[PDB]
Amino acid sequence: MQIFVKTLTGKTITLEVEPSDTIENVKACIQDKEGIPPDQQRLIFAGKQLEDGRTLSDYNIQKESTLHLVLRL
């Protein structure tokens, strides 16, 4: 399936993932495609601050879903 990620500055980065993937893998792909280290990255969705070590199947993410990425200082 395809997912879109957008930041505060404004940019739509498209990724293609699978329900059995890992959130850490998605963060690593984002780091490779953009250069943002996977330590200041925060992924929020539907009000939760999604944690690491889980799978996208837990968070009932479906086709054509939008995620939010906010950095930290």
Binding site: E18, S20, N25, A28, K33, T55
Partner: protein, 1222 residues
């Protein structure tokens, strides 16, 4: 903030729905924001409103949102946790009585987040029991948070308060045996912190220890695989050390619980471990034993820097059992390490054990061990603690057992050392004490043999001025093989130098020539034929034991006398930076700014760029000049500063505390063909004469008392490798395989030196290691040489990347560039050539993307390297020998394309004097591309798939002049038989001509009569064309000159020279030119011709099996161990003939090769997980998924092994050369 104020007024309301909307909007606004966006938010007023709203329990749905809002306020900005942290009593009171699980869980998470910086408040609030009142029947994700907050509360506990943790101590003690990992780690950390903080109160340690904690920690430690990490392993062992040292009664109780068996299982079960773990274990072993008296001969300890004794005075059965259990293991650990602290701790433990034991136990335990040799070797050491330890050990041991230790010391060379020792204030005092003690020892005890005299008599006959025949050598062999000569008599009676001058001397004054001496040595040791009686057949002796025995004795002797120094901060280097002053050496501007920022790891190129941008480079910030040619140069003294050099190293070398403190100054300134006519060829070089020299090589500069043994071992290795060049006929075979020359202690020292981060930060590897690696490479195995080459051959970033990839360890973070190129799968050769020509010499890693693909990372680059390696072998180019085959399982267009394949190896085709210049230009260009590709692939730790041959590697290592007839077997097998038979015939020809009892006519008739398999040379009708290639002339006119008996040796020499050196010269010159444009060939001198294959390509193929698979494979996410699909896949994996193995490797990792070490060497372990499907489609008609970037395998659950087999093959075959998912 405009919406924030409105949210505040909404929060300060009365309507329940209004409050719910307010808190929902509050959390929504908080989670999305960050420090920059949410600036100016009022907290001192909003936070009390949130606290008041949370201080109400008439609704169950808004409490969750209030706790969530507070948690997200904490998480959004780490600056409000000084005012936000005020409702701790409310949190604790809500924890006392539970009505909803979710609110308690969120409160636990918030409290755990708070405890990081404010634990004193919660400690005063008495929440240690409040948390874990109802620890059970919670979720899995909250138990770890509760244990973490408990540990953080116990991090800083005062001795005054104990009742806050006394109630919960048994609960945690029982919890210490849970099956999970993080819970056990947290409980262990809590107990470690408690024991560490309560160290000066014996009663508190006794209260904490109890009797279940010790046994639970024991079973936790013994049970394997390790559920506890290495750091917390060290922490637990240190907790044992503290309890044993600070409380003797606890130590006695721990000893009573047969801890000796546990320590034995930990140490050996020796299991390889980090030096810190061994140090902690040795400290524990030392602390279990009674303390040393401070009166008597132990008064030196005061200047160098009880209940166990009662138990020993009691029934000593336990102490005897402990000593007999662990003395051998302690000595084994001591004799297999290289480190300043571990050796000292082991020495102290052994000294205590020797002192406190009785005579019978010492006699029983010191039977299958060598102590005198170690004492003798450690008496003479610059580290002035080991000398004192050795002297004390000798005194005690020989005072307890005089009779047995009266001949061992005299034979092993201790009495002579003590005699030699006997013959700004602490150093003088300890020297005086050592002198006085040695004098007393010698005067008191040692005041007033057929092996040493026999060896002296034998070595007297080895002098060059006097002939000795061969009796001296057989006597020396008998002494070396069947005797018990120590390592002190070999040194005392000059034998190593006499043997060195016997083997490697050449002068007119010598009584016997060097050739006869070499023959005599090769006859006495090893069964080579005696000089003057060479058999007419072929030399192939069997016996080689004496040489192996002599080599082993020399290695032991070198290990005894070796004295090389090992040298094994981070925050200092990472924090403090350098300041330097620039002074003109005058067309450029004069410097007046003063201090200059100089990063310790910075290079001079950055300084040059800064100077150019600043405007000092002229003859405003401008980027055109920065955006090759060199205009400015930096100098220090009379030595030029290389660009690839760090300023710290420059200061250390050309210009310690002064390096980082004192200011440094750097100046700046603007910048007849005999072969073709006659038919003569160069003679075959013999490598042995380069090695046979008594003087040390120019590369050796270090001074050690163990250099003669090194020289003798070098000479012996040279003789063993190159011994068939001294005979007219022989077969190439090493007398002793080179794996048997490895020294067990030098390798350990090198490995220890290659693990310190700082010496790789600064690149300060000592001279001895590099010189030994470059001059005598046989002293280390392949892994050590590869590590040294990678560390010392390139920049520091690559070295630290290699260290991180081979040894997981003020945190280091390698910094590297990353430049990406895109190619297409239709013109791979041209695009690869363009990429290599553009970015070959760039010091940045090369990642390659694809046009119609989205995937990026290491996998595409590995696939590109594999594709280029395969493409370089097409039969259309015509570069190598071999046969033409069709590739198995080709692509859509790759089918039908012939490829060059050979069973033995690949060698370059020769050309003579009639080759078209365009063809030669094409060959040279292709060779340059291949050389540059290999050079770039070696740097970036990438792997290729090019099966090269041995003569190729010999050419690479500059060994083209020592290619004899035995090297044709690895190139062309059919012509080798003809060459060998013609050599056999020419030997007979020479033998016949060496007889003078004939006539000219008879000699001619005998020469003509000679036949080859019933046919004569005239009947053969050969010529001067290289066999197999009827287009190359060995010499001019080689079409009308038939071969005869009179011209046969010249013909054979011409054939060998043309087929190995002459016709393949320009090609390899082009290869060397292409390779040296990246990094010089001089860095490959570490390796050997038979070892470069492992460095370049992958490891040798081998069959896979589950026993070694149960060491790196780690399944999770629906595939816990002892499942069905995992075992089905594991069984089906080991059913391949390496073809499907390569297919699977390219499917998962992306390369058809594996790193050295097998499945363990792969940094990301093969992690297998389940795949989520729907409830309608059967989980049978689906294909397995792979993420090659991190090696994440997603394997569907099935029911039949046959289905697994039939679908995995399709998945591998029909999903190659594409990345359409990322």
């Amino acid at each position: 903030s405009s919406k924030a104020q409105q949210l505040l007024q909404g929060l300060q309301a009365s309507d329940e729905s209004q409050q719910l909307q307010a808190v929902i909007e509050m959390c929504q606004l908080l989670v999305m924001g960050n420090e920059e966006t949410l600036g100016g938010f009022p907290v001192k007023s909003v936070v009390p409103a949130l606290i008041t709203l949370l201080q109400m329990e008439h609704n169950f749905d808004i409490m969750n949102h209030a706790c969530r809002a507070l948690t997200y306020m904490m998480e959004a900005l780490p600056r409000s946790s000084a005012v936000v942290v005020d409702a701790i009593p409310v949190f604790l009171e809500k924890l006392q009585v539970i009505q909803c699980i979710d609110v308690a869980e969120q409160a636990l998470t918030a409290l755990e987040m708070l405890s990081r910086r404010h634990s004193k408040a919660i400690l005063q609030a008495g929440g240690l029991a409040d948390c874990l009142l109802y620890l059970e029947f919670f979720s899995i994700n909250a138990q770890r948070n509760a244990l973490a907050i408990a540990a953080n509360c116990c991090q800083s506990i005062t001795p005054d308060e104990f009742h806050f943790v006394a109630d919960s101590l048994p609960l945690l003690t029982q919890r210490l045996t849970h099956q999970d990992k993080k819970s056990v780690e947290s409980t262990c950390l809590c107990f470690a912190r408690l024991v560490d903080n309560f160290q000066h109160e014996e009663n508190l340690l006794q209260q904490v220890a109890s009797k279940d904690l010790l046994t639970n920690v024991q079973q936790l430690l013994v049970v394997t695989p390790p559920i506890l990490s290495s750091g917390m392993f060290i922490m637990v062992v240190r907790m044992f050390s503290l309890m044993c040292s600070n409380c003797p009664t606890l130590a006695v109780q721990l000893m009573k619980q047969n801890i000796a068996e546990t320590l034995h299982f930990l140490l050996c079960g020796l299991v390889p471990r980090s030096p810190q773990e061994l140090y902690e274990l040795t400290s524990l072993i030392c602390e279990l034993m009674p303390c040393l008296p401070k009166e008597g001969i132990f008064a030196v300890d005061t200047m160098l820097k009880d209940a166990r004794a009662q138990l020993m005075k009691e029934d000593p059965e336990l102490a005897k059992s402990f000593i007999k259990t662990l003395f051998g293991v302690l000595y084994e650990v001591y004799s297999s390490s290289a480190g300043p602290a571990v050796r000292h701790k082991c020495l102290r433990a052994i000294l205590r054990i020797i002192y406190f034991a009785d005579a019978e136990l010492l006699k029983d335990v010191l039977k299958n061990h060598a102590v005198s040799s170690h004492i003798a070797s450690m008496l003479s050491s610059q580290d002035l603690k080991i000398v004192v330890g050795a002297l004390q050990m000798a005194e005690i041991l020989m005072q307890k057992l005089p009779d047995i230790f009266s001949v061992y010391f005299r034979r092993e060379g201790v009495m002579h050392q003590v005699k030699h020792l006997a013959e700004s204030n602490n150093r003088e005092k300890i020297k005086g004490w050592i002198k006085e003690q040695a004098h007393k020892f010698v005067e008191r005890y040692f005041s007033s043999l057929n092996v040493l005299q026999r060896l002296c008599a034998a070595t007297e006959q080895l002098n060059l001025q006097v002939d000795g025949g061969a009796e001296c050598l057989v006597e020396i062999r008998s002494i070396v093989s069947e005797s018990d000569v120590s390592s002190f008599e070999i040194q005392h009676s000059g034998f190593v130098k006499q043997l060195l001058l016997y083997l490697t001397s050449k002068s007119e004054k010598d009584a016997v020539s060097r050739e006869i001496r070499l023959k005599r040595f090769l006859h006495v040791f090893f069964s080579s034929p005696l000089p003057g009686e060479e058999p007419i057949g072929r030399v192939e002796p069997v016996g080689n034991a004496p040489l192996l025995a002599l080599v082993h004795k020399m290695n032991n002797c070198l290990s005894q006398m070796e004295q090389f120094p090992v040298k094994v901060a981070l925050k200092f280097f990472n924090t403090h930076q350098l300041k330097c002053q620039l002074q003109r050496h005058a067309n450029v501007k004069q410097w007046k700014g003063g201090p200059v920022k100089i990063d310790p790891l910075a290079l001079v190129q950055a300084i040059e760029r800064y100077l150019v941008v600043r405007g000092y480079g002229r003859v405003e910030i401008d980027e055109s000049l920065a955006a090759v040619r060199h205009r400015l140069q930096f100098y220090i003294g009379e030595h030029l500063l290389p660009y690839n050099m760090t300023v710290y190293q420059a200061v250390r070398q050309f210009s310690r505390a002064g390096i980082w403190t004192k200011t440094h100054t750097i100046w700046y300134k603007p910048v007849h063909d005999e072969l073709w006519h006659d038919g003569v060829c160069p003679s075959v070089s013999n490598p042995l004469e380069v090695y046979l020299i008594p003087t040390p090589p120019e590369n050796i500069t270090f001074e050690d008392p163990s250099l003669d043994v090194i020289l003798l071992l070098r000479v012996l290795h040279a003789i063993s490798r190159y011994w068939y060049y001294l005979y007219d006929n022989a077969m190439c075979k090493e007398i002793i395989p080179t794996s048997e020359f490895i020294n067990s202690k030098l390798t350990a020292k090198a490995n220890r030196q290659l693990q310190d981060p700082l010496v790789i930060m600064t690149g300060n590897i000592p001279t001895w290691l590099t010189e030994l690696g470059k001059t005598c490479p046989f002293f280390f195995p392949f892994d050590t040489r590869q590590m040294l080459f990678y560390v010392t051959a390139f920049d520091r970033d690559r070295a630290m990347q290699r260290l991180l990839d081979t040894n997981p360890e003020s945190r280091v973070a390698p910094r590297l560039d990353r430049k990406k190129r895109t190619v297409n799968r239709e013109e791979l050769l041209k695009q690869a050539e363009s990429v290599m020509q553009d970015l070959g010499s760039s010091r940045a890693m090369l990642e390659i993307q694809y046009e119609n693909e989205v995937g990026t990372g290491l996998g595409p680059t590995l696939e590109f390297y594999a594709l280029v390696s395969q493409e370089l072998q097409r039969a259309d180019l015509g570069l190598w020998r071999g046969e033409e085959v069709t590739l198995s399982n080709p692509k859509g267009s790759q089918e039908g394309t012939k490829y060059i394949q050979n069973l033995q190896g690949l060698f370059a085709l020769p050309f003579g004097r009639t080759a078209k210049p365009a063809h030669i230009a094409k060959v040279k260009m292709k060779f340059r591309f291949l050389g540059k590709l290999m050079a770039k692939a070696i740097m970036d730790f990438r792997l290729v798939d090019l099966p090269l041959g041995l003569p190729f590697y010999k050419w690479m290592l500059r060994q083209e002049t020592s290619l004899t007839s035995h090297d044709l077997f690895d190139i062309d097998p059919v012509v080798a038989r003809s060459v060998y038979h013609l050599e056999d015939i020419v030997r007979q020809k020479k033998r016949l001509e060496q007889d003078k009892s004939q006539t000219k006519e008879s000699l001619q008739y005998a020469l003509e009569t000679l036949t080859m398999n019933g046919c004569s040379v005239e009947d053969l009708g050969l010529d001067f064309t290289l066999p197999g290639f009827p287009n190359i002339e060995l010499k001019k006119g080689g079409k009308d000159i038939p071969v005869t008996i009179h011209n046969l040796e010249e013909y054979l020499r011409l054939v060998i020279f043309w087929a190995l050196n002459e016709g393949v010269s320009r090609q390899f010159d082009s290869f060397r030119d292409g390779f040296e444009s990246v990094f010089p060939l001089s860095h490959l001198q570490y390796f050997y011709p038979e070892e470069l294959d492992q460095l370049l390509c992958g490891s040798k193929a081998d069959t896979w099996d589950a026993k070694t698979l149960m060491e790196c494979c780690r399944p999770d996410h629906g595939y816990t161990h002892d499942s069905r699909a995992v075992k089905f896949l594991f069984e089906i994996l080991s059913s391949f003939d390496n073809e499907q193995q390569r297919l699977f490797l390219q499917f998962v990792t992306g390369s058809p090769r594996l790193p050295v070490g097998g499945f363990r060497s792969l940094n990301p372990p093969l992690t297998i997980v389940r795949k989520t499907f729907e409830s309608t489609e059967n989980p049978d008609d689906f294909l397995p998924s792979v993420m090659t970037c991190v090696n994440y395998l997603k394997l569907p659950d099935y029911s039949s092994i046959e289905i697994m087999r039939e679908k995995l093959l399709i998945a591998a075959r029909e999903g190659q050369q594409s990345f359409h998912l990322s």
